[PDB]
Design a protein around this ligand. Structure first.
Ligand SMILES: [Zn+2]
Ligand SMILES: [Zn+2]
Lengths: 124, 126
DNA sequence: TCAGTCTAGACATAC
DNA sequence: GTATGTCTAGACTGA
């Protein structure tokens, strides 16, 4: 696929194996969804410009808050921040949504923001 | 822990080997047992499989929207899956089958419930 | 609580 | 329609 490869172009920790195929799936899932809501552009933008003051990139939130990609389950913001920002990221307890983020996972709205540049990592 | 009832029932034609396939049939039985447990039809299943008496009662399972049943990662028709597991491993499709007038909830009568009593169906050469 | 399993229903196809 | 495979939210389940 197109943009998927581009977005894949950005990422870190080079964790190939089945994690490589998974990372691809996870990116495709997201693209499929942003496409529908016409937010793909603002996502590519955010990724390539590392510009924090970008708009929120939103995905629907599930009842328990988790997202499944393939057979694995996790928190969305944790999955995508670990993708494009911190490959070593461990849990959502290391993540702090900034104040400009309106749909932070921590707010429990109907939509969750996964813009990797809307969260900072806390040295806990 | 996978209840002896399942081990016992597996005994009546596990599923013509094939390592992975073997574990599938267990999943398939595990799934069936769980549902019959909740509706108290277990013993009735034990009975029919062990005695092979066609006069056993209907062993009923909820029907899903499309009529298919998923076990592990495979999908298929309920009666087909259990008739192939305990009677005809050769069984191919739901057409090689036909309920016996006596089966209240045969698959073909599309009711809220589906009978998976393997002894309520007969095989046909199409 | 927290993390992993399981599957009906929703899709997307192809006659 | 009927037939069939893929994916995942929500349900479930121990630790
Ligand atoms: Zn945001
Ligand atoms: Zn019957």
């Amino acid at each position: 696929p197109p943009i998927v490869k581009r977005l894949l172009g950005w990422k870190k920790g080079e964790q190939n194996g089945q994690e490589e195929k998974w990372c691809e799936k996870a990116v495709k899932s997201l693209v499929k969804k942003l496409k529908k809501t016409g937010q793909l552009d603002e996502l590519e933008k955010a990724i390539t410009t590392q510009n924090v003051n970008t708009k929120c990139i939103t995905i629907p939130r599930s009842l328990d808050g988790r997202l499944q990609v393939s057979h694995r389950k996790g928190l969305p913001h944790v999955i995508y921040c670990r993708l494009w920002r911190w490959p070593d990221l461990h849990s959502h307890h290391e993540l702090r949504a900034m104040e400009l983020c309106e749909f932070a996972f921590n707010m429990k709205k109907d939509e969750v923001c996964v813009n990797p540049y809307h969260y900072q990592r806390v040295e806990t």
